[PDB]
Amino acid sequence: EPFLIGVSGGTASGKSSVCAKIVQLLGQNEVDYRQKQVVILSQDSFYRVLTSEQKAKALKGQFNFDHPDAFDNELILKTLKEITEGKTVQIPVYDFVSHSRKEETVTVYPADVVLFEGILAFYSQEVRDLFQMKLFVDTDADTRLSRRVLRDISERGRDLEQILSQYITFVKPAFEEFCLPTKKYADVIIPRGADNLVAINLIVQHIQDILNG
Amino acid sequence: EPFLIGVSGGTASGKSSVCAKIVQLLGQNEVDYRQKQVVILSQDSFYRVLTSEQKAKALKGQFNFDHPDAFDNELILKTLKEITEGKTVQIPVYDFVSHSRKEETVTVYPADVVLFEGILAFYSQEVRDLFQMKLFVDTDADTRLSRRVLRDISERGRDLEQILSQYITFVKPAFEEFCLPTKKYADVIIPRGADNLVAINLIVQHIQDILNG
Amino acid sequence: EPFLIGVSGGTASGKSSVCAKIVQLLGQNEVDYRQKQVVILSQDSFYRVLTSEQKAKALKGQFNFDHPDAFDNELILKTLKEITEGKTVQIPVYDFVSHSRKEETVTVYPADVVLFEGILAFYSQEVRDLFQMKLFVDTDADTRLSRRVLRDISERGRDLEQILSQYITFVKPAFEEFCLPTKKYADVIIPRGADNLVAINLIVQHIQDILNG
Amino acid sequence: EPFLIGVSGGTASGKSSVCAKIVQLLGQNEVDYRQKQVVILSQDSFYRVLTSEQKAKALKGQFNFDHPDAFDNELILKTLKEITEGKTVQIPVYDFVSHSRKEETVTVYPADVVLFEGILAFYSQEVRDLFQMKLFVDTDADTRLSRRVLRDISERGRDLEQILSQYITFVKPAFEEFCLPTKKYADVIIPRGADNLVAINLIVQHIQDILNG
Numbered sequence: 001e002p003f004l005i006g007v008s009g010g011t012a013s014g015k016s017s018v019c020a021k022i023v024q025l026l027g028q029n030e031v032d033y034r035q036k037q038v039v040i041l042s043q044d045s046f047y048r049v050l051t052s053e054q055k056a057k058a059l060k061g062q063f064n065f066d067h068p069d070a071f072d073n074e075l076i077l078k079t080l081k082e083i084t085e086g087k088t089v090q091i092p093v094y095d096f097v098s099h100s101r102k103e104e105t106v107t108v109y110p111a112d113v114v115l116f117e118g119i120l121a122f123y124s125q126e127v128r129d130l131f132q133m134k135l136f137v138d139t140d141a142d143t144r145l146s147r148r149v150l151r152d153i154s155e156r157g158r159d160l161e162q163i164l165s166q167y168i169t170f171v172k173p174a175f176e177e178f179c180l181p182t183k184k185y186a187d188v189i190i191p192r193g194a195d196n197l198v199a200i201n202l203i204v205q206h207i208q209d210i211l212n213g
Numbered sequence: 214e215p216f217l218i219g220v221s222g223g224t225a226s227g228k229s230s231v232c233a234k235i236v237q238l239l240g241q242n243e244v245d246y247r248q249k250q251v252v253i254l255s256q257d258s259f260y261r262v263l264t265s266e267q268k269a270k271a272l273k274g275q276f277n278f279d280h281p282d283a284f285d286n287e288l289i290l291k292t293l294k295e296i297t298e299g300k301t302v303q304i305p306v307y308d309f310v311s312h313s314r315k316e317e318t319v320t321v322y323p324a325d326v327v328l329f330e331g332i333l334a335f336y337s338q339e340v341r342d343l344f345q346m347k348l349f350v351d352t353d354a355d356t357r358l359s360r361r362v363l364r365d366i367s368e369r370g371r372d373l374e375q376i377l378s379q380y381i382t383f384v385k386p387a388f389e390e391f392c393l394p395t396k397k398y399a400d401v402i403i404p405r406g407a408d409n410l411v412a413i414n415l416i417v418q419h420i421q422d423i424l425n426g
Numbered sequence: 427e428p429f430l431i432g433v434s435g436g437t438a439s440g441k442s443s444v445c446a447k448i449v450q451l452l453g454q455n456e457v458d459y460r461q462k463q464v465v466i467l468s469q470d471s472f473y474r475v476l477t478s479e480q481k482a483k484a485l486k487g488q489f490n491f492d493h494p495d496a497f498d499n500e501l502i503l504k505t506l507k508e509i510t511e512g513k514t515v516q517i518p519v520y521d522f523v524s525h526s527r528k529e530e531t532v533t534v535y536p537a538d539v540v541l542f543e544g545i546l547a548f549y550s551q552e553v554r555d556l557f558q559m560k561l562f563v564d565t566d567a568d569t570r571l572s573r574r575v576l577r578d579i580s581e582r583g584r585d586l587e588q589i590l591s592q593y594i595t596f597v598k599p600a601f602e603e604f605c606l607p608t609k610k611y612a613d614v615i616i617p618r619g620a621d622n623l624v625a626i627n628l629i630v631q632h633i634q635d636i637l638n639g
Numbered sequence: 640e641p642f643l644i645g646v647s648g649g650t651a652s653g654k655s656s657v658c659a660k661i662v663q664l665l666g667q668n669e670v671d672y673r674q675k676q677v678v679i680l681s682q683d684s685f686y687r688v689l690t691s692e693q694k695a696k697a698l699k700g701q702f703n704f705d706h707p708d709a710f711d712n713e714l715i716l717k718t719l720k721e722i723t724e725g726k727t728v729q730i731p732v733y734d735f736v737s738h739s740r741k742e743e744t745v746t747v748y749p750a751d752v753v754l755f756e757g758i759l760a761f762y763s764q765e766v767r768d769l770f771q772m773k774l775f776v777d778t779d780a781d782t783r784l785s786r787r788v789l790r791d792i793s794e795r796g797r798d799l800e801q802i803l804s805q806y807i808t809f810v811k812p813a814f815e816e817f818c819l820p821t822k823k824y825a826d827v828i829i830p831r832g833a834d835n836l837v838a839i840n841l842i843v844q845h846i847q848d849i850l851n852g
């Protein structure tokens with residue numbers, strides 16, 4: 001029943017902002033949580049719980065959060081399957097500042113349209129096949145690195161050199177090995193991320209049509 | 214005023230078939246010529262009339278039909294502006310077999326939506342500014358060459374050797390120098406071409422909305 | 427022990443002609459077979475013997491000769507190791523017209539320098555580690571397709587349609603999945619191919635040094 | 640008489656370090672300044688003197704040091720021509736910390752081999768034709784940005800946000816518009832910059848051969 005839209009692109013490409021803008025333009029930020037018609041799920045909500053050793057390494061920017069193994073892919077698939085079945089689900093909340101899953105959770109009631117966004121949203125064939133539309137937010141790597149540096153220092157309490165070390169060591173290689181090869185599965189490529197008002201209004205209009213019947 | 218959609222991409226990327234699929238799905242092929250609400254204009258209709266020396270080289274695959282100068286940009290601008298003003302216009306008919314413009318012209322009546330497609334549709338800023346939406350059909354160069362070889366032999370009366378010679382000598386360099394750099398002006402990138410049904414349906418749905426108001 | 431130089435690059439990038447130009451410039455074509463100091467080995471000599479079903483599909487351009495499995499990597503490793511040990515070896519002769527290995531084999535006597543070239547020469551780590559120098563011939567995909575079409579029609583008994591079909595279906599995908607990713611192992615990237623005289627002369631000069639001691 | 644080698648690549652690709660390593664391995668750092676056989680000239684030595692307004696903007700990372708206009712190209716050409724004529728020349732010394740030409744200068748006596756390195760070494764046809772060998776140090780843009788950030792903060796007294804602003808606004812666009820299109824003129828592409836010992840020893844050996852006669 002629900003129409004699932006998968007959204008991918010590299011880190012800091014604008015995935016989160018594109019999805020947030022779409023939902024805001026659809027007037028969903030005003031709808032009762034129990035009656036939202038369009039919701040956004042982030043693949044990062046499903047990052048795995050780290051062991052003491054792993055967290056230690058994460059604090060030093062030495063843990064690989066960009067490899068498919070960093071995510072609980074079974075939980076992702078099972079949650080998406082339940083959503084397609086019209087079931088109400090609970091989604092974990094991840095804290096990038098402490099590299100941990102919070103205690104609080106977000107309950108997702110049956111929706112008509114679901115946006116699932118993540119750096120590896122198209123990595124798994126099973127997950128891919130669940131999407132009726134696949135969008136890829138394409139932003140150059142150097143541009144994304146500049147955005148990631150500014151974002152991580154000002155929002156995630158990260159140190160510049162740690163960010164750059166983590167990026168060169170893990171983010172870049174994993175993006176090239178696991179994310180780029182999935183771009184070919186996208187139906188539509190969106191450049192300029194959240195500043196692309198034309199592409200965004202196009203998706204908004206399409207979703208509204210789907211909502212109207 | 215009519216809603217203009219510009220469509221670009223390299224040679225044989227799928228521009229013509231994408232526009233053709235869009236109007237077919239909109240049911241325009243079952244509407245009388247005078248009653249069509251969506252019409253397709255091709256930049257190739259505006260190739261310049263060749264001088265005798267130019268045609269000579271053209272017959273040997275030694276003329277550059279991929280340079281911006283090969284198109285009558287002044288006529289393109291004039292024609293598109295008149296269309297924007299709701300005027301009925303006559304446009305030339307180009308024959309790829311003879312590298313020449315035919316005697317007959319095509320009457321383009323006022324339509325609600327106009328698709329203008331061509332390898333250098335986004336080259337001119339004045340032209341570019343007339344499009345309310347810009348689409349770029351992105352298809353790999355080798356895939357496109359394959360498509361062009363078969364198409365040119367079967368539709369444009371060309372022979373293998375000349376096609377490859379012209380491609381390597383003029384088409385490839387011109388694409389990199391003049392076409393590729395215009396990709397940044399597109400609002401939406403459609404990979405592969407006419408087989409991309411989700412992207413096509415997104416544009417069809419958008420156009421149907423314009424037609425309904 | 428002999429100095430081994432590995433050479434890779436996509437199909438028709440210019441690997442064979444680059445190696446051929448190098449030995450020609452070193453004057454090896456004017457030296458008796460037994461006296462040659464620089465020899466060329468092609469990975470294509472190690473294609474596997476096809477089963478009846480495989481040859482059937484091969485005749486229709488429906489067999490994947492671009493997958494690592496299409497080569498006998500065990501024989502390649504064994505042969506190269508023996509050559510490294512200064513042993514004389516016999517290598518197979520492959521016929522592209524019939525997709526089969528000939529009855530006769532070629533005797534490879536101990537040489538001071540060995541050029542081993544092939545589309546997947548850097549795929550195997552064990553093989554890769556035997557090369558003291560690795561060169562990757564980088565030529566654009568469309569340029570390469572053009573070259574392959576002409577070469578395959580004139581040298582490998584293929585017809586246009588089948589070539590393009592095989593290329594798009596197996597060659598292109600395999601290059602992106604298996605060949606392209608090995609480019610990172612090259613020490614030197616030689617663009618364009620055999621027409622790159624400065625790059626070729628650099629390798630010739632380097633080899634002449636090895637020959638002089 | 641002198642053999643000129645042009646070296647290009649984007650900012651922080653490793654151009655300076657590659658050239659320095661080559662000269663050091665050739666034993667030139669021990670030779671009397673008046674008798675050096677191999678010398679390195681940097682295109683940055685020829686940055687233009689800024690006006691008061693320009694310097695003000697430079698202090699804010701708002702001046703375009705990546706456009707061909709930022710360099711005194713006539714002085715570059717004339718100096719290279721004089722060097723080819725065996726003339727002794729004087730080369731300005733640039734200070735990145737103060738965005739200015741210093742008073743001190745470096746005198747360059749007749750050399751046998753000259754390495755000229757810069758982000759736009761291959762931009763001018765006249766300058767390009769002076770080179771008998773053209774090398775391009777190829778390093779990914781995101782990797783180069785990370786290196787540039789670390790370098791500018793620790794060696795050029797620049798602020799992080801100013802570096803990123805200057806990079807996004809000027810460096811990246813100019814690299815893509817003016818530098819990338821010159822890569823096609825390179826004879827040899829060198830990856831991994833100064834860590835590529837194989838490629839570096841190859842150039843060293845070639846130069847030594849040129850020096851020996």
Ligand SMILES: Nc1ncnc2c1ncn2[C@@H]1O[C@H](COP(=O)(O)OP(=O)(O)O)[C@@H](O)[C@H]1O
Nearest residue numbers: 011012013014015016017147151192193194195
């Ligand atoms: N179009 C843009 N221009 C400049 N900065 C942007 C743009 N889009 C996003 N950013 C910034 O880049 C960072 C990446 O944000 P986000 O939308 O969450 O990307 P992603 O979800 O792919 O990681 C954010 O800090 C955001 O404010």
Ligand SMILES: Nc1ncnc2c1ncn2[C@@H]1O[C@H](COP(=O)(O)OP(=O)(O)O)[C@@H](O)[C@H]1O
Nearest residue numbers: 223224225226227228229230360364406407408
């Ligand atoms: N998905 C596809 N698979 C096989 N052939 C295709 C596909 N898409 C287009 N073609 C063919 O490729 C050629 C390029 O066609 P066209 O749509 O006219 O591109 P363009 O208008 O950009 O030049 C045509 O002969 C067309 O029928």
Ligand SMILES: Nc1ncnc2c1ncn2[C@@H]1O[C@H](COP(=O)(O)OP(=O)(O)O)[C@@H](O)[C@H]1O
Nearest residue numbers: 436437438439440441442443573577619620621
């Ligand atoms: N610079 C060039 N210009 C035109 N044709 C070329 C050039 N270089 C190679 N070719 C041709 O392209 C084809 C590819 O040849 P080859 O050297 O065998 O490449 P590879 O060994 O990588 O498959 C050959 O038919 C060859 O003669």
Ligand SMILES: Nc1ncnc2c1ncn2[C@@H]1O[C@H](COP(=O)(O)OP(=O)(O)O)[C@@H](O)[C@H]1O
Nearest residue numbers: 650651652653654655656786790831832833834
């Ligand atoms: N191979 C490398 N690995 C890590 N850092 C490097 C490497 N090569 C250079 N760097 C660093 O990157 C910066 C770029 O240096 P440089 O050689 O001067 O490049 P360019 O001359 O192209 O600007 C320097 O601060 C240097 O120490």
Ligand SMILES: Nc1ccn([C@@H]2O[C@H](COP(=O)(O)O)[C@@H](O)[C@H]2O)c(=O)n1
Nearest residue numbers: 010011012044047065066096099119171
């Ligand atoms: N604890 C974590 C979890 C993820 N991440 C990063 O978050 C990125 C994915 O989130 P964005 O799509 O929002 O960029 C990954 O590239 C990864 O390196 C992190 O830096 N620390």
Ligand SMILES: Nc1ccn([C@@H]2O[C@H](COP(=O)(O)O)[C@@H](O)[C@H]2O)c(=O)n1
Nearest residue numbers: 223224225257278279309312331332384
């Ligand atoms: N007489 C002509 C006119 C155009 N052309 C080619 O047609 C192409 C543009 O049309 P397509 O977008 O349909 O490929 C150009 O790349 C150009 O080389 C040609 O081959 N002969």
Ligand SMILES: Nc1ccn([C@@H]2O[C@H](COP(=O)(O)O)[C@@H](O)[C@H]2O)c(=O)n1
Nearest residue numbers: 436437438470491492522525544545597
């Ligand atoms: N029987 C065979 C064996 C190999 N090949 C092709 O030969 C190529 C490898 O040789 P080149 O490097 O000379 O191009 C592969 O891309 C493969 O498709 C073929 O077309 N038929």
Ligand SMILES: Nc1ccn([C@@H]2O[C@H](COP(=O)(O)O)[C@@H](O)[C@H]2O)c(=O)n1
Nearest residue numbers: 649650651683686704705735738758810
């Ligand atoms: N005053 C100056 C002059 C040049 N530059 C930078 O120096 C770079 C070129 O030097 P590198 O090749 O050493 O990176 C340019 O990208 C330019 O932005 C600067 O940041 N301030």
Ligand SMILES: [Mg+2]
Nearest residue numbers: 012015016017
């Ligand atoms: Mg995000």
Ligand SMILES: [Mg+2]
Nearest residue numbers: 225228229230
């Ligand atoms: Mg067309």
Ligand SMILES: [Mg+2]
Nearest residue numbers: 438441442443
């Ligand atoms: Mg070959």
Ligand SMILES: [Mg+2]
Nearest residue numbers: 651654655656
């Ligand atoms: Mg430098």
